[PDB]
Amino acid sequence: RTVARDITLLECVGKGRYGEVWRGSWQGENVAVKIFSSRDEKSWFRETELYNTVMLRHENILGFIASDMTSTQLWLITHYHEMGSLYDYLQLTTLDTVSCLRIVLSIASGLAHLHIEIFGGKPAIAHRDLKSKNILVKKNGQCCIADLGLAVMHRVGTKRYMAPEVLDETIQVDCFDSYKRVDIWAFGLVLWEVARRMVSNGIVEDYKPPFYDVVPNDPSFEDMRKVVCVDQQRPNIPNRWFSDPTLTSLAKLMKECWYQNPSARLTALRIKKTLTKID
Amino acid sequence: ARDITLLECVGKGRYGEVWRGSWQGENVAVKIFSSRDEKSWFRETELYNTHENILGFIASDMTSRHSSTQLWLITHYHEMGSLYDYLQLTTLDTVSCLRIVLSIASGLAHLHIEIFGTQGKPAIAHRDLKSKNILVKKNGQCCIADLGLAVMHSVGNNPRVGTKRYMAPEVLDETIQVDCFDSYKRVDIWAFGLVLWEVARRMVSNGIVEDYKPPFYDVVPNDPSFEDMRKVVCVDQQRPNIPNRWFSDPTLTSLAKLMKECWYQNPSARLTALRIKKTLTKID
Ligand SMILES: COc1cc(-c2cncc(-c3ccc(C4CCN(C)CC4)cc3)c2C)cc(OC)c1OC
Ligand SMILES: COc1cc(-c2cncc(-c3ccc(C4CCN(C)CC4)cc3)c2C)cc(OC)c1OC
Ligand SMILES: COc1cc(-c2cncc(-c3ccc(C4CCN(C)CC4)cc3)c2C)cc(OC)c1OC
Ligand SMILES: COc1cc(-c2cncc(-c3ccc(C4CCN(C)CC4)cc3)c2C)cc(OC)c1OC
């Protein structure tokens, strides 16, 4: 029998320090192909090792197809999501109560699935690089979490999204729950980025990245540590949110993701429960 | 062109399957790992992410749809098969014998030795040397295969690994210094010694040759257990017998001395891969 391994690379949909992502084709079907830079080689090994241990299958987790090493090119092949990243989608799109709640509930579902140990099954997983660029929008209005390059099974990540215990290096490195709590911090920021683009009473905010008003682009560790750890600043909740019951509930939720004390933050399971009681 | 055609299965076992295949009109070997051996696939893939006497890497693939995963390793194909196979129905002369064993020594020295620069390699202990893990090339030289238990140094945890028949005494009595990289290189030399013995037996001298036998064929039951090997190697302190006819031949007399120096109970007493390459280089 023949093994069709011809993956056609059609257009580049992303370039960065990580390498490149390509819309590709395998046997008619659209696939996404990540070509790892030498800089990010370790991420391919971490992610391949994870999927060699547990084959994750969840509607809110970017779907694995293949990990390939060729003579050295390192490739990750996934399902393709033509709508692109939540980051990209939020720039050009506003949301209503239904689309906003569908997006944030699907992210919480995907994250709770990563975090939970299932017996029989999967180990518990912390993502450690959650951000709006690492979330993709599906045609059914749900999202999926992508990029398990830094994932841990039971510092690193995007500086703008790092929890204060990461920035001030007080994180208990030998405690798995520490890495879950770092994920909730970043989830709280993503929730803020999405809520801003939900219309209420004819009002919406601009797309802005977290801490857009207090740090430059490509903020330094020191920039982030001063804002988040020393000054203990948190993203602004606009007045207009408190005229909307959904945005009022989401504001309370994001505050409970942003405590300086990691152990005080909500769990993914508790956020999922709270979000189902909202509308 | 990435289209791989699977033509014939050349091997099946606990490890999975191996297949002769086609890929851009060239012959390739395709190992499909068993779910038992999934850690070996990942370990081998990290090793190969770094020579004429190491099985040549082409690709490594993890593929999945739903709950089903396939692990592939694609390498160059060697028509003449494993040294194990080759020694079954072939006898050797001085020239063939030395070329085989010098090539294996060369590969193992290359694995064992750290090279520096941007084009280099760490030091590697193989940990699973046997005649089935060596392949015969058409130029009569060999290459070492199966880096799935290999260990790098600039660790590899779990138990008591390798092929029982080739396990060193420190592996069988489990006194091996698990944190010591040199221990693992020394395990290789033991196993290499047993491979020298398998090969030397098939070299004709003065019109005499021994038939093919695996190490300890005569002293353990067929399909020996870990305990069976421990008894003969550790308790009885047995080593493969040197046929007296070898002592009439200068080459086999030198090879007998070499394999004795691979078989010390003291690992530190054993020769290094490099010393073996140099001694074998001096024999003619
Ligand atoms: C190696 O590489 C790639 C391969 C493929 C690919 C193409 N056709 C068929 C397959 C296949 C899957 C699974 C089995 C099973 C059948 C049952 N049997 C008991 C065990 C094995 C056989 C064949 C694959 C894996 C796609 C790829 O890309 C999406 C690959 O990566 C480039
Ligand atoms: C984050 O991480 C990974 C993501 C993906 C991935 C999967 N589907 C679609 C996309 C995508 C497509 C298109 C746009 C843009 C550009 C085109 N224009 C029309 C607007 C839209 C953005 C994004 C991506 C980036 C794959 C990965 O691996 C193969 C990733 O790494 C794990
Ligand atoms: C990696 O990705 C894709 C792979 C394939 C694909 C191609 N040939 C054969 C297979 C296959 C057949 C049968 C089994 C099972 C059957 C039950 N039991 C006996 C174990 C073996 C597994 C696998 C697959 C999954 C198709 C895809 O899409 C159409 C893939 O996605 C791009
Ligand atoms: C040990 O290890 C690996 C080996 C190989 C490999 C490479 N060339 C040729 C072979 C071969 C071909 C054919 C025979 C035949 C000979 C005659 N016949 C009656 C019985 C058997 C045996 C051996 C193999 C097995 C590939 C591997 O991976 C892709 C290996 O794993 C790393």
XYZ file of C-alpha atoms and ligand atoms in Angstrom:
691
model
C 0.000 0.000 0.000
C 1.050 3.660 -0.692
C 1.512 6.169 2.220
C 0.507 9.605 0.780
C 2.991 11.929 2.624
C 2.768 14.750 -0.036
C 1.698 17.836 2.025
C 1.493 20.882 -0.325
C 2.394 24.273 1.307
C 0.005 26.844 -0.271
C 0.357 30.143 1.694
C 2.249 31.392 4.804
C -0.290 32.579 7.466
C 2.359 33.475 10.135
C 6.132 34.188 10.593
C 7.907 34.877 13.938
C 10.731 33.770 16.304
C 8.906 30.320 16.461
C 9.329 29.814 12.665
C 6.377 29.890 10.216
C 2.803 28.546 9.900
C 1.528 27.566 6.426
C -1.936 26.748 5.127
C -1.212 23.406 3.403
C -3.025 20.551 1.631
C -2.938 16.795 2.357
C -5.207 14.612 0.092
C -7.662 17.481 -0.716
C -8.018 18.452 3.056
C -6.645 21.762 4.486
C -3.940 21.352 7.173
C -1.849 23.860 9.104
C 1.949 23.203 9.018
C 4.254 24.783 11.632
C 7.954 24.773 10.525
C 9.997 25.224 13.747
C 12.976 27.609 13.753
C 16.240 26.166 15.197
C 15.681 28.729 18.031
C 12.386 26.849 18.984
C 13.622 23.208 18.358
C 12.947 22.343 22.060
C 9.214 23.232 21.602
C 8.820 20.577 18.848
C 10.434 17.950 21.193
C 8.254 19.009 24.223
C 5.018 18.951 22.141
C 5.825 15.651 20.298
C 6.727 14.013 23.681
C 3.366 15.243 25.116
C 1.319 13.815 22.168
C 3.437 10.547 22.291
C 2.267 10.295 25.981
C -1.425 11.375 25.489
C -3.280 11.882 22.147
C -5.477 14.921 23.116
C -8.847 15.030 21.264
C -11.128 17.946 22.272
C -13.305 20.373 20.226
C -11.521 23.335 22.047
C -7.903 22.022 21.543
C -6.240 22.480 18.108
C -6.381 18.998 16.532
C -3.104 17.095 16.132
C -2.406 15.350 12.750
C 1.424 14.741 12.709
C 4.934 15.581 14.055
C 7.631 15.106 11.325
C 11.469 15.245 11.455
C 13.074 15.263 7.918
C 16.839 15.245 6.977
C 16.932 18.642 10.064
C 13.441 20.163 9.293
C 10.941 19.933 12.275
C 7.193 20.135 11.281
C 3.954 20.124 13.361
C 0.782 19.416 11.330
C -2.686 20.293 12.709
C -6.250 21.007 11.567
C -6.552 24.389 9.718
C -8.989 27.115 11.029
C -9.533 29.561 8.123
C -10.988 32.273 10.443
C -7.515 32.478 12.100
C -6.499 33.620 15.618
C -8.802 35.244 18.231
C -6.183 38.052 18.158
C -6.812 38.597 14.391
C -10.632 38.183 14.745
C -10.990 40.715 17.633
C -9.156 43.489 15.593
C -11.928 43.666 12.916
C -15.010 42.131 14.662
C -17.328 43.207 17.522
C -19.375 40.644 19.462
C -22.853 40.343 21.019
C -23.763 38.596 24.293
C -24.153 35.211 22.486
C -20.873 35.258 20.410
C -18.871 36.728 23.396
C -20.128 33.991 25.795
C -19.625 31.227 23.131
C -15.930 32.309 22.697
C -15.043 32.603 26.457
C -16.956 29.418 27.458
C -15.161 27.391 24.658
C -11.701 28.685 25.886
C -12.613 27.750 29.505
C -13.803 24.269 28.255
C -10.485 23.726 26.390
C -8.401 24.991 29.372
C -10.384 22.900 31.960
C -9.805 19.852 29.684
C -6.025 20.589 29.627
C -5.902 21.065 33.450
C -8.050 18.035 34.527
C -6.495 14.590 35.140
C -8.869 11.901 33.624
C -8.256 8.346 35.003
C -8.614 5.075 32.968
C -7.610 9.053 30.288
C -5.035 11.922 30.406
C -2.499 13.508 32.747
C -3.220 17.076 33.938
C -1.489 19.637 31.593
C -0.569 23.327 32.099
C -0.303 25.312 28.816
C 2.064 28.082 30.081
C 1.727 30.213 26.886
C -2.007 31.151 26.769
C -2.715 34.353 24.783
C -5.188 35.568 22.098
C -2.675 34.610 19.278
C -2.626 31.017 20.680
C -6.445 30.708 20.361
C -8.116 30.008 16.968
C -11.752 30.846 15.966
C -13.886 27.977 14.494
C -16.791 28.530 12.032
C -19.282 27.335 14.746
C -18.325 30.387 16.962
C -16.255 28.284 19.443
C -12.467 28.606 19.804
C -9.656 26.088 20.276
C -6.442 26.531 22.341
C -3.225 26.051 20.303
C 0.546 25.818 20.887
C 1.525 23.204 23.506
C 5.270 23.988 22.869
C 5.767 24.942 26.590
C 3.155 22.518 28.056
C 3.962 20.541 31.277
C 2.248 17.249 32.290
C 1.569 15.968 35.863
C 10.851 32.610 32.781
C 9.027 31.199 29.670
C 5.996 32.447 27.696
C 4.882 35.901 26.417
C 6.060 38.640 28.855
C 2.790 40.710 28.451
C 0.791 37.642 29.744
C 3.193 36.441 32.522
C 1.711 36.082 36.039
C 3.415 38.215 38.746
C 4.978 35.110 40.468
C 6.687 34.348 37.056
C 7.925 37.956 36.565
C 9.223 38.209 40.228
C 10.449 34.514 40.160
C 8.484 33.518 43.393
C 6.540 30.749 41.529
C 6.912 27.384 43.408
C 8.671 25.565 40.484
C 8.229 22.063 42.129
C 4.379 22.486 42.408
C 2.252 21.521 39.327
C -0.724 23.709 40.558
C 1.636 26.766 40.162
C 1.577 26.325 36.338
C -2.253 25.928 36.340
C -2.540 29.245 38.301
C -0.243 30.954 35.702
C -2.762 29.765 33.017
C -5.708 31.344 34.917
C -3.821 34.688 35.154
C -3.424 34.701 31.307
C -7.041 33.448 30.828
C -8.248 36.462 32.841
C -6.337 38.779 30.405
C -7.807 37.015 27.302
C -11.320 37.388 28.884
C -10.584 41.158 29.208
C -9.445 41.395 25.514
C -12.740 39.679 24.321
C -15.160 41.514 26.735
C -13.863 44.877 25.362
C -15.193 43.953 21.876
C -18.694 42.936 23.144
C -21.232 45.759 22.351
C -23.548 46.956 25.159
C -25.936 49.952 24.890
C -24.385 50.874 21.481
C -20.865 51.087 23.080
C -17.703 48.994 22.405
C -13.930 49.467 23.053
C -11.111 49.291 20.463
C -9.110 46.041 20.333
C -6.146 46.505 22.708
C -3.628 44.021 24.104
C -3.367 43.708 27.893
C -1.382 46.592 29.569
C -1.382 48.536 26.239
C -1.571 51.801 28.291
C 1.353 51.167 30.758
C 4.126 49.285 28.744
C 5.611 49.741 25.247
C 5.372 47.172 22.403
C 7.689 44.183 23.077
C 7.810 45.124 26.797
C 10.976 44.182 28.752
C 10.820 41.859 31.844
C 11.545 44.994 33.938
C 8.643 46.954 32.262
C 6.213 44.067 33.092
C 7.612 43.393 36.636
C 7.165 47.104 37.614
C 3.538 47.309 36.324
C 2.340 43.862 37.559
C 4.492 43.029 40.643
C 5.674 46.337 42.151
C 2.679 48.638 41.325
C 0.211 45.618 41.223
C -1.634 47.275 38.268
C -4.485 45.351 36.531
C -6.317 46.094 33.248
C -9.038 48.849 33.458
C -12.741 47.778 33.679
C -14.689 50.538 31.801
C -17.772 52.088 33.493
C -20.059 50.999 30.559
C -19.529 47.270 31.583
C -21.447 47.860 34.853
C -24.623 48.758 32.798
C -24.492 45.184 31.266
C -25.183 42.049 33.380
C -22.870 39.838 31.199
C -19.882 42.298 31.273
C -20.538 42.843 35.047
C -20.251 39.043 35.576
C -17.132 38.815 33.308
C -15.466 41.772 35.213
C -15.987 39.863 38.510
C -14.530 36.723 36.796
C -11.399 38.438 35.437
C -10.698 40.032 38.895
C -10.839 36.482 40.391
C -8.167 35.383 37.778
C -5.846 38.352 38.691
C -5.193 38.001 42.487
C -1.476 38.571 43.330
C -1.802 35.381 45.502
C -1.906 32.425 43.021
C -3.794 30.069 45.437
C -6.675 32.652 45.637
C -7.396 32.525 41.837
C -10.422 30.532 40.503
C -9.756 27.080 38.930
C -10.661 26.370 35.231
C -13.426 23.983 36.494
C -14.926 26.807 38.695
C -14.700 29.355 35.788
C -16.492 26.850 33.455
C -19.314 26.442 36.068
C -19.643 30.256 36.574
C -19.732 30.892 32.759
C -22.648 28.395 32.185
C -24.773 30.245 34.882
C -24.153 33.570 32.912
C -27.056 34.023 30.387
C 7.985 13.516 -3.414
C 7.204 12.150 0.115
C 5.055 9.169 -1.170
C 6.355 5.993 0.645
C 5.287 2.589 -0.849
C 5.527 -0.414 1.563
C 6.706 -3.402 -0.652
C 7.571 -6.288 1.796
C 7.768 -6.851 5.578
C 11.393 -7.877 6.418
C 10.748 -8.151 10.205
C 7.977 -8.469 12.863
C 8.318 -8.696 16.690
C 7.817 -7.040 20.133
C 9.434 -3.830 18.657
C 6.761 -3.570 15.892
C 7.463 -4.229 12.156
C 10.144 -3.237 9.567
C 9.324 -2.899 5.829
C 11.334 -2.509 2.606
C 9.732 0.526 0.888
C 10.214 2.989 -2.022
C 10.617 6.804 -1.682
C 11.721 8.880 -4.752
C 12.602 5.559 -6.558
C 15.228 4.691 -3.819
C 14.769 1.663 -1.468
C 14.076 2.711 2.198
C 13.523 0.834 5.490
C 10.336 1.799 7.467
C 10.088 0.760 11.155
C 6.507 1.041 12.529
C 6.959 0.930 16.344
C 4.753 -1.168 18.694
C 2.841 0.829 21.396
C 5.176 -1.110 23.805
C 8.188 0.782 22.268
C 6.800 4.384 21.989
C 9.510 5.760 24.396
C 12.189 4.109 22.138
C 10.751 5.948 19.051
C 10.973 9.353 20.841
C 14.468 8.533 22.298
C 15.779 7.472 18.792
C 14.231 10.661 17.224
C 16.128 12.901 19.787
C 19.378 10.898 19.154
C 19.077 11.211 15.329
C 18.402 15.000 15.715
C 22.262 15.277 15.860
C 28.913 8.459 9.698
C 29.228 5.459 7.263
C 28.809 2.941 10.207
C 25.532 4.311 11.765
C 22.206 3.372 10.020
C 21.403 6.549 8.029
C 18.354 8.626 9.098
C 15.786 9.871 6.499
C 12.651 10.757 8.581
C 10.735 10.191 11.870
C 6.903 10.664 11.947
C 4.190 10.550 14.632
C 0.765 10.460 12.859
C -2.687 10.375 14.582
C -6.409 10.527 13.740
C -8.910 9.981 16.594
C -7.356 7.722 19.332
C -4.988 5.822 16.936
C -1.235 6.828 16.713
C 1.443 5.456 14.301
C 5.187 5.982 15.035
C 7.461 5.679 11.907
C 11.286 5.661 11.542
C 12.551 5.787 7.920
C 16.222 4.876 7.200
C 18.445 3.737 4.328
C 17.820 0.079 3.345
C 20.598 -2.610 3.424
C 19.569 -5.504 1.054
C 21.999 -8.006 2.697
C 20.128 -7.597 6.053
C 21.554 -8.025 9.591
C 25.083 -9.325 10.437
C 23.073 -11.969 12.387
C 21.459 -13.084 9.056
C 24.766 -12.732 7.089
C 26.757 -14.958 9.586
C 24.091 -17.777 9.267
C 24.844 -18.869 5.645
C 28.282 -17.150 5.051
C 31.849 -18.037 6.146
C 34.576 -15.321 6.070
C 38.311 -15.029 5.238
C 40.806 -12.761 7.121
C 39.914 -9.735 4.923
C 36.062 -9.989 5.284
C 36.268 -10.800 9.033
C 38.534 -7.804 9.893
C 36.560 -5.341 7.648
C 33.269 -6.271 9.415
C 34.722 -5.987 12.970
C 36.872 -2.861 12.193
C 33.710 -1.145 10.748
C 31.658 -1.972 13.906
C 34.551 -0.761 16.161
C 34.717 2.458 14.044
C 30.953 3.129 14.422
C 31.052 2.410 18.174
C 34.145 4.664 18.684
C 32.304 7.429 16.687
C 29.166 6.936 18.904
C 31.289 6.917 22.110
C 33.429 10.053 21.272
C 32.285 13.709 21.837
C 33.058 16.120 18.887
C 32.900 19.990 19.322
C 31.905 23.028 17.151
C 28.557 23.940 15.398
C 28.992 20.745 13.263
C 29.643 18.128 16.038
C 27.920 15.519 18.329
C 27.736 14.535 22.033
C 28.980 11.144 23.380
C 26.494 8.210 22.995
C 26.288 4.753 24.676
C 24.125 2.438 22.472
C 23.072 -0.040 25.267
C 21.508 -2.614 22.817
C 24.448 -3.944 20.724
C 23.790 -7.395 19.165
C 24.321 -8.989 15.683
C 20.589 -8.249 14.800
C 21.283 -4.482 15.485
C 24.147 -4.448 12.926
C 23.468 -4.355 9.143
C 25.856 -5.562 6.360
C 26.622 -3.146 3.448
C 27.591 -4.262 -0.134
C 31.160 -2.841 0.365
C 31.419 -5.575 3.139
C 31.471 -2.887 5.917
C 28.748 -2.747 8.636
C 26.573 -0.037 10.262
C 25.211 0.002 13.861
C 21.400 0.331 14.143
C 18.714 0.890 16.818
C 19.451 4.012 18.966
C 16.124 3.458 20.887
C 17.906 2.694 24.241
C 20.897 4.987 23.456
C 22.036 7.557 26.127
C 23.728 10.963 25.414
C 26.368 12.904 27.446
C 27.996 16.371 26.782
C 20.460 10.539 31.318
C 18.168 7.557 30.486
C 16.210 6.263 33.536
C 13.891 3.158 33.919
C 15.405 -0.384 34.599
C 17.625 -3.227 33.105
C 17.439 -2.865 29.304
C 18.967 -4.539 26.213
C 19.018 -8.116 24.830
C 19.477 -10.605 27.720
C 22.065 -12.774 25.881
C 24.328 -9.657 25.461
C 23.805 -8.101 28.963
C 27.030 -7.236 30.901
C 27.482 -8.739 34.406
C 26.825 -5.309 36.102
C 23.424 -5.161 34.198
C 22.475 -8.774 35.165
C 23.398 -8.268 38.915
C 22.024 -4.649 38.642
C 25.166 -3.229 40.381
C 25.611 -0.773 37.425
C 26.255 2.904 38.422
C 22.923 4.182 36.882
C 24.137 7.864 37.130
C 27.541 7.046 35.459
C 27.761 7.553 31.632
C 31.077 5.583 31.477
C 29.168 2.524 32.875
C 27.031 2.527 29.661
C 30.024 2.757 27.293
C 31.475 -0.269 29.228
C 28.213 -2.266 28.720
C 28.674 -1.630 24.939
C 32.296 -3.032 24.995
C 31.043 -6.221 26.742
C 28.370 -6.676 23.986
C 30.905 -5.781 21.226
C 33.175 -8.539 22.587
C 30.313 -11.084 22.177
C 29.769 -9.809 18.577
C 33.559 -10.251 17.818
C 33.209 -13.849 19.053
C 30.078 -14.510 16.819
C 31.991 -13.188 13.749
C 35.424 -14.810 14.498
C 33.681 -18.238 14.685
C 32.728 -17.828 10.974
C 36.281 -16.961 9.798
C 37.941 -20.013 8.101
C 41.530 -20.843 9.222
C 43.517 -23.990 8.193
C 40.305 -25.332 6.494
C 38.265 -25.109 9.801
C 35.205 -22.942 10.739
C 32.586 -23.119 13.555
C 28.877 -22.931 12.603
C 26.850 -19.838 13.701
C 25.940 -19.795 17.460
C 24.620 -16.868 19.578
C 26.557 -15.934 22.761
C 26.105 -18.619 25.542
C 24.193 -20.986 23.124
C 25.692 -23.995 24.998
C 25.144 -22.961 28.693
C 21.568 -21.424 28.787
C 18.125 -22.650 27.673
C 16.636 -21.403 24.353
C 14.964 -17.975 24.885
C 16.941 -17.448 28.127
C 15.419 -15.423 31.023
C 17.239 -12.514 32.837
C 17.825 -14.992 35.704
C 19.254 -17.719 33.325
C 21.882 -15.168 32.027
C 22.650 -13.851 35.584
C 23.386 -17.470 36.677
C 25.919 -18.203 33.833
C 27.527 -14.704 33.577
C 27.463 -13.591 37.274
C 27.301 -16.820 39.395
C 29.243 -19.278 37.074
C 31.569 -16.445 35.704
C 31.322 -18.041 32.208
C 32.637 -16.465 28.962
C 32.231 -17.766 25.383
C 34.726 -20.621 24.663
C 37.741 -19.864 22.403
C 38.113 -22.731 19.867
C 41.722 -24.135 20.159
C 42.014 -23.995 16.295
C 42.100 -20.100 16.596
C 45.533 -20.304 18.338
C 47.080 -21.660 15.026
C 45.940 -18.428 13.232
C 47.639 -15.070 14.060
C 44.505 -12.954 13.266
C 42.127 -15.144 15.362
C 44.784 -15.333 18.163
C 44.737 -11.445 18.227
C 40.851 -11.340 18.076
C 40.633 -13.906 20.972
C 42.912 -11.605 23.092
C 40.736 -8.570 22.107
C 37.416 -10.253 23.121
C 38.966 -11.436 26.480
C 39.743 -7.712 27.191
C 36.011 -6.858 26.502
C 34.893 -9.510 29.049
C 36.573 -8.507 32.376
C 34.061 -8.607 35.310
C 35.670 -5.221 36.238
C 34.034 -2.783 33.735
C 36.925 -0.243 34.179
C 39.446 -2.997 33.142
C 37.692 -3.367 29.714
C 39.263 -1.739 26.592
C 37.683 1.443 25.122
C 36.016 1.470 21.640
C 39.014 3.643 20.518
C 41.702 1.113 21.722
C 39.734 -1.648 19.855
C 39.612 0.412 16.602
C 43.440 0.984 16.907
C 44.340 -2.690 17.702
C 42.035 -3.864 14.810
C 43.720 -1.202 12.571
C 47.170 -2.768 13.423
C 45.971 -6.390 12.583
C 46.485 -7.409 8.868
C 4.571 8.771 7.825
O 4.190 10.117 7.483
C 2.872 10.418 7.182
C 1.940 9.405 6.901
C 0.597 9.713 6.624
C -0.297 8.536 6.338
C -0.832 8.423 5.058
N -1.589 7.379 4.733
C -1.863 6.405 5.612
C -1.366 6.445 6.916
C -1.678 5.302 7.828
C -2.170 5.456 9.121
C -2.403 4.337 9.918
C -2.150 3.047 9.452
C -2.421 1.878 10.339
C -3.312 0.845 9.654
C -3.528 -0.335 10.598
N -2.255 -1.001 10.905
C -2.517 -2.202 11.730
C -1.359 -0.059 11.612
C -1.114 1.210 10.788
C -1.642 2.889 8.158
C -1.404 4.010 7.358
C -0.546 7.518 7.292
C 0.029 7.598 8.702
C 0.174 11.049 6.593
C 1.094 12.068 6.864
O 0.690 13.385 6.837
C -0.624 13.839 7.193
C 2.442 11.750 7.163
O 3.371 12.729 7.447
C 4.050 13.377 6.369
C -1.003 29.482 17.258
O -0.383 28.221 16.989
C -0.690 27.563 15.830
C -1.712 27.990 14.976
C -1.997 27.303 13.793
C -3.100 27.786 12.881
C -4.150 26.927 12.564
N -5.174 27.328 11.742
C -5.195 28.574 11.216
C -4.178 29.512 11.499
C -4.303 30.889 10.885
C -4.764 31.056 9.584
C -4.880 32.340 9.047
C -4.568 33.491 9.784
C -4.701 34.868 9.217
C -3.813 35.093 7.988
C -4.617 34.995 6.692
N -5.683 36.016 6.568
C -6.725 35.488 5.655
C -6.231 36.390 7.890
C -6.165 35.199 8.854
C -4.131 33.339 11.082
C -4.011 32.058 11.619
C -3.107 29.091 12.343
C -1.970 30.026 12.679
C -1.262 26.154 13.521
C -0.233 25.735 14.369
O 0.514 24.618 14.102
C 0.517 23.989 12.830
C 0.046 26.453 15.516
O 1.021 26.059 16.358
C 0.654 25.050 17.286
C -2.750 11.212 10.360
O -3.853 11.827 9.691
C -4.752 11.144 8.905
C -4.679 9.775 8.666
C -5.619 9.132 7.856
C -5.503 7.662 7.666
C -5.072 7.151 6.445
N -4.966 5.820 6.267
C -5.286 4.948 7.243
C -5.691 5.381 8.496
C -6.026 4.365 9.554
C -6.776 3.213 9.261
C -7.150 2.323 10.277
C -6.721 2.538 11.595
C -7.044 1.631 12.737
C -8.328 0.815 12.562
C -8.625 0.047 13.864
N -7.491 -0.801 14.326
C -7.364 -2.050 13.530
C -6.212 -0.051 14.375
C -5.928 0.646 13.045
C -5.958 3.675 11.889
C -5.612 4.576 10.880
C -5.817 6.788 8.698
C -6.298 7.417 9.985
C -6.628 9.871 7.249
C -6.688 11.253 7.491
O -7.630 12.062 6.943
C -8.563 11.583 5.986
C -5.759 11.867 8.309
O -5.815 13.206 8.499
C -5.181 14.120 7.579
C 17.796 -3.332 13.571
O 17.245 -2.043 13.401
C 16.743 -1.610 12.204
C 17.090 -2.196 10.985
C 16.594 -1.712 9.773
C 16.985 -2.399 8.500
C 17.639 -1.705 7.505
N 17.984 -2.288 6.340
C 17.704 -3.556 6.111
C 17.047 -4.314 7.072
C 16.789 -5.738 6.737
C 16.351 -6.078 5.477
C 16.112 -7.406 5.166
C 16.336 -8.418 6.091
C 16.034 -9.816 5.669
C 17.210 -10.540 5.044
C 16.693 -11.830 4.408
N 15.380 -12.253 4.970
C 15.064 -13.664 4.645
C 15.314 -12.113 6.432
C 15.519 -10.663 6.835
C 16.786 -8.072 7.366
C 17.023 -6.748 7.674
C 16.649 -3.726 8.286
C 15.902 -4.513 9.375
C 15.740 -0.606 9.794
C 15.392 -0.029 11.023
O 14.547 1.025 11.106
C 13.907 1.588 9.970
C 15.888 -0.523 12.222
O 15.570 0.058 13.435
C 16.276 1.235 13.814
